[PDB]
């Protein structure tokens, strides 16, 4: 029904039609998560080479 905020230009035009009214982590933490995962990888790899050593 009600058309509002009609704006026109050479490229086109835009508007709004209303039918009815209503009724973060830091760089420190990130580098810590990534390195904590790297240690867990290094531990698993160490256990393998330890197992293979046996």
């Amino acid at each position: 029904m009600e058309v509002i905020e009609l704006n026109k230009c050479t490229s086109g035009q835009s508007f709004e039609v209303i039918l009815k009214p209503p009724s973060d982590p830091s760089l420190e933490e990130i580098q810590k998560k990534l390195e904590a995962a790297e240690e867990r990888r290094k531990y698993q790899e160490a256990e393998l080479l330890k197992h293979l050593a046996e």
Binding site: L6, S11, G12, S14, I18, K20, A37, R41
Partner: protein
């Protein structure tokens, strides 16, 4: 004018990115060698198209884009592509071995050894910006790179560029074209880690695009080339306001304001029409009423769901071609009395309309026919939660047996992150429920 940087991650992001930039060049009249005959301001300027392009003294118009993949296969086809001259080496980043469809491998393992390089190449573009508003990130949910590395990148960008907005164009996984089995894991994981860092994300279910290519283009077996061309058209409709003169969605912040009242619920449903085959000889051109009515057919949505059994929080209509406000309001009035369009009580039942007189451009030799008028509806409906429900169910079936979990644990990730991610998704489904019913 304020610049926008596009980021393409993984196979899906890169190939889709190529389709988009190919389409952008055709729309703005930019040639493969970067030259733009219509641009009379040689060496620079601050027109609307400069949001996505920067200019050299030689008059070349280069995309403000960065391609990144942990494997050189796909990006190499960009280096040797028809638009090879368009970009320059520093924009194209490639690794040695991929993430093997593993989120943890793309996030923690391989993600850590290249994240600094990418941010550096991104920072190079950011320095060429007088006023950067944010980023457009293209990636898949299924891929290890698209899921894993993107979430890591989104985290750092929120740190390195706090005041900047960040939009997503995500490919929701579909078994019909996917070749991996652990994509539900990667999807839940990347969504969980990315949620707080993304302001607005447009999901595109390959299932929907796949069937649209079968149903409306009569392609028996759609390839990624078929899907990406059609996807790029939708993306173009969404980003047209950033690349052309207008007053609706002229900056990234306005996407949040117009489509996203609640931060966490930032997944607008896209619906596009008309999709006509190019090899279709006789085609009766569709009117404003017909294409606008097609925006409420589930068979035209980027994600298959039922908006009737949900609630709207916002709705934008983006037309391209021969369209005028009078015909739109007449079409809206008819559709309103014939369809179930329930808005939330704390939102006005209305439509923010945007029109661009230039009809939608199609790539020569493509599958799409040139139409007199097209439309893309961006509606934030709770009905899109059905996609989360489908995905979380697949996740639960696999995680109940801890299947494939050892692959993620073996990359340094803790098994607790699976459940913590699943819990966040459980909270998300609840948020949709509260608003929806």
């Amino acid at each position: 004018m304020r610049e926008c940087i596009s980021i393409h991650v993984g196979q899906a992001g890169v190939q889709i990115g190529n389709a988009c930039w190919e389409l952008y060049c055709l729309e703005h009249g930019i040639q493969p060698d970067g030259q733009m005959p219509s641009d009379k301001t040689i060496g620079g300027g601050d027109d609307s198209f400069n949001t996505f392009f920067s200019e050299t003294g030689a008059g070349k118009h280069v995309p403000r884009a960065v391609f990144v993949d942990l494997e050189p296969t796909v990006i190499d086809e960009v280096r040797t592509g028809t638009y090879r001259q368009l970009f320059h080496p520093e924009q194209l980043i490639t690794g040695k071995e991929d993430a093997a469809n593993n989120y943890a491998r793309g996030h923690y393992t391989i993600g850590k050894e290249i994240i600094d390089l990418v941010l550096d190449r991104i920072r190079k573009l950011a320095d060429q910006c007088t006023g950067l508003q944010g980023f457009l990130v293209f990636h898949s949910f299924g891929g290890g790179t698209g899921s894993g590395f993107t979430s890591l990148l989104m985290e750092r960008l929120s740190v390195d560029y706090g005041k900047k907005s960040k939009l997503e164009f995500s490919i929701y996984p579909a078994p019909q074209v996917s070749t991996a089995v652990v994509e539900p894991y990667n999807s839940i994981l990347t969504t969980h880690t990315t949620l707080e860092h993304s302001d607005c994300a447009f999901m595109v279910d390959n299932e929907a695009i796949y069937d649209i290519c079968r149903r409306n283009l009569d392609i028996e077996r759609p390839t990624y080339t078929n899907l990406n061309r059609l996807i790029s058209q939708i993306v173009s409709s969404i980003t047209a306001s950033l690349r052309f003169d207008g007053a609706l969605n002229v900056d990234l912040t306005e996407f949040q304001t117009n489509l996203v009242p609640y931060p966490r619920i930032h997944f607008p449903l896209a619906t596009y029409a008309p999709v006509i085959s190019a090899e279709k000889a006789y085609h009766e051109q569709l009117s404003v009423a017909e294409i606008t009515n097609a925006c409420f057919e589930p068979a035209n949505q980027m994600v298959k769901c039922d908006p009737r059994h949900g609630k709207y929080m916002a709705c934008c209509l983006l037309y391209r071609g021969d369209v005028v406000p009078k015909d739109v309001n007449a079409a809206i009035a008819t559709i309103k009395t014939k369809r179930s369009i329930q808005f939330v009580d704390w939102c006005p039942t209305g439509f923010k309309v945007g029109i661009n007189y230039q009809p939608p451009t199609v790539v020569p030799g493509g599958d799409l026919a040139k139409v007199q008028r097209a439309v893309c509806m961006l509606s934030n409906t709770t009905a899109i939660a059905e996609a989360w429900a489908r995905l979380d169910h697949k996740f639960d079936l696999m995680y109940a047996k801890r299947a494939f979990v050892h692959w993620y644990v073996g990359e340094g990730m803790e098994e607790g992150e699976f459940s913590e991610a699943r819990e966040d998704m459980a909270a998300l489904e609840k948020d949709y429920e509260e608003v929806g019913v």
